[PDB]
Design a protein around this ligand. Structure first.
Ligand SMILES: [Cl-]
Length: 122
């Protein structure tokens, strides 16, 4: 039924994955807030799966910025996966693509996982 389900992938140890359930508005923002402060073993790489996310508002954008800042404070590398052309446009206009780095943004989980594995191997 879902060939790109995280359960169908090989996820390296030290890589955490978080899947967003839909439009990235206040509901998602409240759920993502502080996630890194509640993981005991801080991940080397954190992949935010955004295949279900076509749109993001100011509240979700604020939460994504603070999430990226918590990753930096933790030495965790944030990757975005499943980013559609529409979501990319919104993230770019917000200034997030240039702050994160283009090379950290992927259109598919397989590509993000490939880069995650490379990162852990270093
Ligand atoms: Cl994804």
């Amino acid at each position: 039924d879902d060939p790109d389900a995280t359960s169908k992938k090989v996820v390296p140890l030290g890589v955490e994955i978080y899947e967003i359930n839909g439009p990235f508005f206040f509901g998602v923002a409240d759920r993502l807030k502080g996630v890194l402060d509640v993981i005991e073993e801080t991940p080397k790489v954190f992949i935010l799966r955004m295949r279900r996310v076509p749109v993001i508002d100011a509240t979700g954008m604020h939460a994504l910025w603070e999430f990226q800042e918590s990753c930096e404070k933790r030495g965790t590398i944030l990757l975005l996966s499943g980013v559609s052309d529409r979501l990319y446009g919104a993230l770019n206009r917000f200034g997030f693509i240039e702050a994160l780095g283009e090379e950290r943004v992927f259109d598919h989980i397989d590509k993000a996982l490939a880069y995650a594995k490379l990162l852990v191997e270093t």
